[PDB]
Design a protein around this ligand. Structure first.
Ligand SMILES: NC(=O)c1ccc[n+]([C@@H]2O[C@H](COP(=O)([O-])OP(=O)(O)OC[C@H]3O[C@@H](n4cnc5c(N)ncnc54)[C@H](OP(=O)(O)O)[C@@H]3O)[C@@H](O)[C@H]2O)c1
Ligand SMILES: Nc1nc(=O)c2nc(CNc3ccc(C(=O)N[C@@H](CCC(=O)O)C(=O)O)cc3)cnc2[nH]1
Ligand SMILES: [Mn+2]
Ligand SMILES: [Mn+2]
Ligand SMILES: [Mn+2]
Length: 159
């Protein structure tokens, strides 16, 4: 099974200048809980944005060019990325925009955080078709002293 996990600001913005400008510790904790002990697939730009391997997960990086760090696994196509995960119950695709576009048609589950924040971005989550997805979990949180925007955790499953 392939799942996508992402945090979306207003208008599906996910990034600006190869960074995420907000800071929502509760959402990073949600990301860790839902990805730990699973393989994670990311594109090369997201690898450079994170800046280090994510511990406790097999890190698989998509790039057309040879890898430059043997602490992670480098692959050259979608099918090779999936194969490099082995026989696991759930593969987590962690972006960025181009990678989400390619894996969305193959995904059965979306883990989405909707952040009530406006930022001027250059990368968006794919327009997906709402009729194709059933919301199976949603949990709203008001802003607090640690999390400066309200946010909504949602899990959607392909109908
Ligand atoms: N808010 C969130 O949830 C979230 C999550 C992840 C990322 N982000 C943000 O998203 C932005 C990065 O997204 P992005 O769309 O620019 O880049 P991306 O999807 O991270 O990376 C694209 C790169 O991945 C490689 N690639 C993708 N598909 C491939 C394929 N089929 N075969 C071979 N290589 C492939 C290519 O690398 P080569 O050029 O080396 O071939 C391509 O240039 C950043 O702003 C980051 O902060 C946000
Ligand atoms: N919901 C969601 N939020 C995100 O921030 C997110 N980020 C990415 C890509 N970028 C990043 C950037 C940093 C870390 C990170 O530092 N993760 C640590 C945090 C642990 C914690 O804060 O408790 C990790 O071990 O996962 C992960 C992904 C992909 N999907 C996401 N999905
Ligand atoms: Mn092929
Ligand atoms: Mn197999
Ligand atoms: Mn706000």
């Amino acid at each position: 099974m392939i799942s996508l996990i992402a945090a979306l600001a207003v208008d599906r913005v996910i990034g600006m200048e190869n960074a995420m400008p907000w800071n929502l510790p509760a959402d990073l904790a949600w990301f860790k809980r839902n990805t730990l002990n699973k393989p994670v697939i990311m594109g090369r730009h997201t690898w450079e944005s994170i800046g280090r391997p994510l511990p406790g997960r097999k890190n698989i990086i998509l790039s057309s060019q040879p890898g430059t760090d043997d602490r992670v696994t480098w692959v050259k196509s979608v099918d090779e990325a999936i194969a490099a995960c082995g026989d696991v119950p759930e593969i987590m695709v962690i972006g960025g925009g181009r990678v989400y576009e390619q894996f969305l048609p193959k995904a059965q589950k979306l883990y989405l955080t909707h952040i009530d924040a406006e930022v001027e971005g250059d990368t968006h989550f794919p327009d997906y078709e709402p009729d194709d997805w059933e919301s199976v979990f949603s949990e709203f949180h008001d802003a607090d002293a640690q999390n400066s925007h309200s946010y909504c955790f949602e899990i959607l499953e392909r109908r």
